[PDB]
Structure 1
Amino acid sequence: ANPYERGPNPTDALLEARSGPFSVSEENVSRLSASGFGGGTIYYPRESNTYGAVAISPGYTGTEASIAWLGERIASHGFVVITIDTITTLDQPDSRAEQLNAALNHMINRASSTVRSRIDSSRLAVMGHSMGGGGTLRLASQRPDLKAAIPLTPWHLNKNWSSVTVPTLIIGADLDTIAPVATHAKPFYNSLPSSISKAYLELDGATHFAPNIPNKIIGKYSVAWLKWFVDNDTRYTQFLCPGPRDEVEEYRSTCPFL
């Protein structure tokens, strides 16, 4: 038995639904309460258990409101998720890495007993949009004990992520003009080691802001990635490997993963 396994046997329909099967509550993190980040919202399963924990960063000028849907949706599949605000709207990717790190430490050590009691502090992941996705790659490089990293339409001036050993799913948007896949997402994917678990999923007919709107493909693949890498949930490998065919423009991976 896998002691980390949560929730029912998955299907495409259950993964593409707006909500998973776990009822969710929220805990506000004020700016005053937050050390090292701008505050945010913690989404957690009402059902008492331990779960993996995830921190998600927005991009430049963005706030937690732009990633709230994704925090709620992932939490509804059996994760504790914080959507952060940054200290300023100007903060760059390497700063968003530090703030993601501070948000994970907050959930583990400084949140209510309600939140702390629901976290397995040994099973952590990070995600983010645009510069938040650049932050995701930077923190993954600094914190190899993270179980997963999911950069969404990521932006970073550093193109070389050969130091990352955290299982990483990069989601690019084909029509992105702010973090074009040719200069950001693909170079990031290509520089990650060939020897790690990784994938690149490019959305078809998608702009840079696809991750800011509820999106069944982002929701399905983010949850499947977190289930396999954070929970060792073998029921989810079927969605990742071989993974989706040519609303997916392309899918590259180091499948098989199991």
Structure 2
Amino acid sequence: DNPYQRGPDPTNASIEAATGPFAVGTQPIVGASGFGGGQIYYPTDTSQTYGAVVIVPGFISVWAQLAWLGPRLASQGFVVIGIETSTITDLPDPRGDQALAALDWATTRSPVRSRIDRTRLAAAGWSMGGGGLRRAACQRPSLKAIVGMAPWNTEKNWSCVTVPTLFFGGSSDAVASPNDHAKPFYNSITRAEKDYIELCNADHFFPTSANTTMAKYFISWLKRWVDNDTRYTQFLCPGPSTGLFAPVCASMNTCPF
């Protein structure tokens, strides 16, 4: 009845799995304009189309530092566009412009354009790449979701955002501290469903290593908004429990949406 739902009915185990139910293919990004290249990941099952998410790096870093996300998310039934920025010191707004340029490359020019539903797109990023999501969402309010991982931006006013927003913060992150970055961003968004999850003891580099707590909620957010898949509302609402000895130290959201 929802034509965009993919994969079997989920469970806590299915969303925590390193590999989802979709076999994954991959290839480098070759010939693209408006960003630095990178790597695409996608289901090999071409019986149907899938939503796509672009993922942008941010701490003076390259795609390799986020690459575990490519198979982790593509295997749940998404095309993942993991990009290099034009330069490793690009500012956040240019990174947002590059996220949109990578989505346009993927849907109009990439070898896998035919298995993307160009109407169902999302953007994500770490650090300054996460900071770029304000530009991406406010320049392209048709996006279905944005997901910021330790997002960094001097611009604290994200009230322009009308796209469902998930932020992950790290309790031990001194570079993009929740108090100065993610939480102000989250508090400023008044026109979109939103979700903030803070990982205990996690430093600015938490997104750069396989992290099941981050992955499960990233997957759930993509499913809910990119695929309209209300089978995944159960993991988002109420969402994680919080505590100093738990993986999650803080949790805020607009459940029930």
Which whole-Å CA distance do the structure 2 matches of 1:47 and 1:164 have between them? 33
Other structure's SS at 1:37 match: coil
Aligned to 1:13: 13
Which whole-Å CA distance do the structure 2 matches of 1:138 and 1:176 have between them? 23
Q: Kindly state the Cα deviation for residue 104 of structure 1 after the two structures are TM-superposed.
A: 0.1
Q: Kindly state the Cα deviation for residue 60 of structure 1 after the two structures are TM-superposed.
A: 3.2
Per-residue deviation, residues 156-207 of structure 1 (Å, max 9, x unmatched): 01000001000000110010011111100110000011x4210110111111
Q: Kindly state the Cα deviation for residue 4 of structure 1 after the two structures are TM-superposed.
A: 0.1
Map of 1:70-219 to 2, 5 A cutoff? 70-112=69-111, 115-193=112-190, 195-219=191-215
Per-residue deviation, residues 107-152 of structure 1 (Å, max 9, x unmatched): 001111xx11110000000000000000112211211100000010
8 Å contact from structure 1 (residues 60, 92) kept in 2: no
Per-residue deviation, residues 10-69 of structure 1 (Å, max 9, x unmatched): 111111111111010012113xx1200000111000001100011000013211111111
Which whole-Å CA distance do the structure 2 matches of 1:68 and 1:9 have between them? 27
8 Å contact from structure 1 (residues 137, 151) kept in 2: no
Aligned counterpart in structure 2 of residue 36 of structure 1, from 26, 31, 34: 34
Per-residue deviation, residues 60-97 of structure 1 (Å, max 9, x unmatched): 32111111111211100000011000111110101110
Which whole-Å CA distance do the structure 1 matches of 2:250 and 2:226 have between them? 24
* 5+ residue gaps, structure 2: none
Aligned to 2:44: 46
Other structure's SS at 1:20 match: coil
- Please, which moves more after superposition, 135-144 or 72-81? 135-144
Aligned to 1:2: 2
1:149 alignment partner AA:
I
Which whole-Å CA distance do the structure 1 matches of 2:167 and 2:199 have between them? 11
Q: Aligned residues, how many?
A: 252
Which whole-Å CA distance do the structure 2 matches of 1:18 and 1:136 have between them? 26
Q: Kindly state the Cα deviation for residue 216 of structure 1 after the two structures are TM-superposed.
A: 0.1
Other structure's SS at 2:68 match: helix
Per-residue deviation, residues 195-226 of structure 1 (Å, max 9, x unmatched): 42101101111111110000001110000000
Which whole-Å CA distance do the structure 2 matches of 1:173 and 1:137 have between them? 20
Asked whether 1:225 is paired with 2:205, we answer: no
Which whole-Å CA distance do the structure 2 matches of 1:41 and 1:220 have between them? 22
1:209 alignment partner AA:
F
Which whole-Å CA distance do the structure 2 matches of 1:60 and 1:175 have between them? 16
Other structure's SS at 1:222 match: helix
Other structure's SS at 1:164 match: coil
Structure 2 length normalisation: TM-score? 0.96
Identity %: 56
8 Å contact from structure 1 (residues 20, 73) kept in 2: yes
8 Å contact from structure 1 (residues 60, 91) kept in 2: no
1:236 alignment partner AA:
Y
Following superposition, which runs of at least 4 residues in structure 1 exceed 6 angstroms of deviation?
A: none
